[PDB]
Amino acid sequence: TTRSWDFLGFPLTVPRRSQVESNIVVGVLDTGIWPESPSFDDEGFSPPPPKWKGTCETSNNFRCNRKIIGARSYHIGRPISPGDVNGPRDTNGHGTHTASTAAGGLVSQANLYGLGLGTARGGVPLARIAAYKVCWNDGCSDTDILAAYDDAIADGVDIISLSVGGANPRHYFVDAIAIGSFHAVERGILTSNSAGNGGPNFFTTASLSPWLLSVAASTMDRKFVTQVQIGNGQSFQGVSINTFDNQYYPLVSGRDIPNTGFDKSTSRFCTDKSVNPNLLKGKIVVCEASFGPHEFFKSLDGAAGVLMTSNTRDYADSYPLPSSVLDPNDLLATLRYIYSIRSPGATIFKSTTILNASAPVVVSFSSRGPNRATKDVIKPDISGPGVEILAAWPSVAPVGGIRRNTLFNIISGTSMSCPHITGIATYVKTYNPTWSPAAIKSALMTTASPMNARFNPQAEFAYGSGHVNPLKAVRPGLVYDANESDYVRVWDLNYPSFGLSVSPSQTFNQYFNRTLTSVAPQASTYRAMISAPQGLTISVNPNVLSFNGLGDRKSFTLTVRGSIKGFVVSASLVWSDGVHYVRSPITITSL
Ligand SMILES: *[C@@H]1O[C@H](CO)[C@@H](O[C@@H]2O[C@H](CO)[C@@H](O[C@@H]3O[C@H](CO[C@H]4O[C@H](CO)[C@@H](O)[C@H](O)[C@@H]4O)[C@@H](O)[C@H](O)[C@@H]3O)[C@H](O)[C@H]2NC(C)=O)[C@H](O[C@@H]2O[C@@H](C)[C@@H](O)[C@@H](O)[C@@H]2O)[C@H]1NC(C)=O
Numbered sequence: 090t091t092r093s094w095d096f097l098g099f100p101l102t103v104p105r106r107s108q109v110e111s112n113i114v115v116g117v118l119d120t121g122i123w124p125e126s127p128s129f130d131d132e133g134f135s136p137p138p139p140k141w142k143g144t145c146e147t148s149n150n151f152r153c154n155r156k157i158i159g160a161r162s163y164h165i166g167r168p169i170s171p172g173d174v175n176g177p178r179d180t181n182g183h184g185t186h187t188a189s190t191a192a193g194g195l196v197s198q199a200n201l202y203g204l205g206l207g208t209a210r211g212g213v214p215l216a217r218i219a220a221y222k223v224c225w226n227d228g229c230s231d232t233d234i235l236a237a238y239d240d241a242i243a244d245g246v247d248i249i250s251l252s253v254g255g256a257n258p259r260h261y262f263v264d265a266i267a268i269g270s271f272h273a274v275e276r277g278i279l280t281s282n283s284a285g286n287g288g289p290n291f292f293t294t295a296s297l298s299p300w301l302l303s304v305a306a307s308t309m310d311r312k313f314v315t316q317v318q319i320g321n322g323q324s325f326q327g328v329s330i331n332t333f334d335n336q337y338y339p340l341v342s343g344r345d346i347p348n349t350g351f352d353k354s355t356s357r358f359c360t361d362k363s364v365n366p367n368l369l370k371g372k373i374v375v376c377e378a379s380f381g382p383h384e385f386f387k388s389l390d391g392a393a394g395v396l397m398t399s400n401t402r403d404y405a406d407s408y409p410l411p412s413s414v415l416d417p418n419d420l421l422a423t424l425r426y427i428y429s430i431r432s433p434g435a436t437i438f439k440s441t442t443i444l445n446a447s448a449p450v451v452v453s454f455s456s457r458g459p460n461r462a463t464k465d466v467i468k469p470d471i472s473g474p475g476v477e478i479l480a481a482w483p484s485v486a487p488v489g490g491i492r493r494n495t496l497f498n499i500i501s502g503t504s505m506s507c508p509h510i511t512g513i514a515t516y517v518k519t520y521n522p523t524w525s526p527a528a529i530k531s532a533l534m535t536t537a538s539p540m541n542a543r544f545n546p547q548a549e550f551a552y553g554s555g556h557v558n559p560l561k562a563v564r565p566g567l568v569y570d571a572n573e574s575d576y577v578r579v580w581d582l583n584y585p586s587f588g589l590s591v592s593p594s595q596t597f598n599q600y601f602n603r604t605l606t607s608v609a610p611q612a613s614t615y616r617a618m619i620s621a622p623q624g625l626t627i628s629v630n631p632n633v634l635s636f637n638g639l640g641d642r643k644s645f646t647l648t649v650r651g652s653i654k655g656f657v658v659s660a661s662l663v664w665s666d667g668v669h670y671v672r673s674p675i676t677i678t679s680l
């Protein structure tokens with residue numbers, strides 16, 4: 090966040106509408122909020138909007154200010170779970186992180202043990218925040234969500250950031266988030282929702298509702314790496330967020346030190362207590378696998394360092410001990426070294442950062458479509474920064490499995506990119522106070538910049554309409570407006586993109602209807618530009634539209650005939666008038 094915003098072309102110097110921005114309330118459903126964080130400072134803030142109706146649960150060591158003007162909790166079912174606390178207070182850290190990502194104010198020198206140093210901020214530092222705590226160690230219940238929504242709607246929230254939801258895509262018909270968001274939409278309130286972290290398989294996203302803006306997690310240029318240097322003098326580049334200073338320690342293999350009743354067939358991975366604690370103490374264990382902080386304590390208490398392995402390393406995480414996830418080969422290279430001189434040694438360095446030019450690429454865990462409820466309503470809808478995002482953290486909240494004196498943490502997930510979209514959507518809202526949820530969501534989609542299908546073969550079912558563009562989202566020129574009155578043919582649903590399910594090698598011919606509403610003051614003509622593959626034929630009538638002014642609408646029909654042989658084939662439509670550009674992806678699937 091000390092870097093994502095700049096990576097999105099959203100500088101500290103972007104123009105603002107401070108007056109409207111300061112009167113906007115961003116409701117955040119998550120694990121609560123930690124009031125004390127610098128990201129939620131009050132200084133200078135005028136008093137809350139007169140038309141705000143929310144309140145604050147201040148009977149248990151919590152206090153709202155003029156930044157955080159609302160805070161409530163929901164555990165309707167049974168009693169509070171173990172380790173949790175009564176009230177709006179965030180003890181998990183998830184809600185605090187999320188809130189600062191979307192609306193956190195400027196905090197300089199923001200850093201996690203030096204890592205990611207910079208100026209932390211939210212997309213809208215002046216908006217007010219209203220926290221609705223609905224997630225516990227107990228989980229997040231359906232009753233709490235519906236209830237929290239109700240309050241948000243009546244309190245007067247303007248937009249809602251929802252970083253929860255990952256149920257089996259097939260349980261989509263019994264998902265409450267669709268109920269809440271729907272009622273929210275009827276009152277002109279948009280919802281940003283993380284797609285899920287169940288990728289990369291072809292049908293892992295559970296954020297299926299149409300009125301819901303779904304967001305996937307992509308990378309940014311900045312990348313955390315941890316250099317490991319074994320005895321020979323050769324280095325390897327591993328990923329992890331290592332805050333421990335550079336140190337040197339003896340090396341050992343999991344196979345060489347099995348534990349009573351274990352075979353080296355499981356010791357390799359040194360998991361499930363398959364390693365003798367005695368011959369492990371004070372050394373950097375080398376294991377053929379990748380596990381979390383829990384397994385560190387469970388199986389490796391005593392070890393001074395850990396070296397893991399994985400074929401996937403497009404994101405980093407912090408651990409309880411000097412650690413680093415190496416590439417399969419660099420691992421074998423390290424193992425040989427162990428059986429070489431017999432008395433090895435490696436030095437795990439404190440993480441550093443490289444710049445990856447391929448970014449933004451949607452990360453591996455990001456849930457991807459098609460929409461299991463309707464393959465013709467493509468999802469995700471868009472992408473944003475969700476890998477290694479540094480933002481506000483509670484002082485009591487553990488980091489990577491231990492305690493660290495830090496006010497910021499670095500974590501990844503679709504729940505990190507959602508807040509980004511939430512903040513950007515609020516920004517657009519500050520400039521276009523009257524647009525509806527579908528209008529705001531359209532702006533961000535039609536104005537998103539195209540992503541590379543060579544990096545993410547799944548095309549749209551991985552990044553939807555592409556990567557967000559904050560400043561172009563403000564003046565989209567035209568919008569695919571809608572409202573609950575339209576969710577009562579699927580291909581004729583005024584969506585910002587087009588989808589179509591087909592059978593392998595089987596000529597087809599579909600047609601789609603849409604209506605664009607102008608949001609720009611000046612009249613202008615928008616000629617159309619298509620870009621379809623080979624085995625397909627696409628056209629649009631009209632292919633030229635004029636708009637006399639603000640409000641005017643026009644329709645058109647898109648036809649798609651052809652026959653794809655592969656799984657996913659994409660094309661695009663674009664309605665430019667010179668100044669404005671309005672692209673809408675076109676996806677065809679063989680499932
Ligand atoms: C700069 O960022 C890019 C984007 O994340 C890094 O490229 C990715 O690196 C990961 C990590 O190893 C690769 O993961 C393996 O992926 C394969 C196949 O799945 C991937 O590729 C196919 C075809 O392109 C797609 O259909 C999939 O959606 C997916 O993208 C899988 O079998 C393995 O089990 C791993 O999961 C990933 O493929 C790769 N994606 C892209 C777009 O290239 C890049 O990492 C470098 O390049 C990769 C290929 C490895 O050689 C890494 O070791 C390199 O570091 C990163 N570069 C730097 C400097 O960090």
Ligand SMILES: *P(=O)(OC(C)C)OC(C)C
Pocket residue numbers: 183252253254255283284285286500501502503504505
């Ligand atoms: P986010 O990515 O939220 C999803 C589970 C919806 O989760 C964090 C804890 C990584």
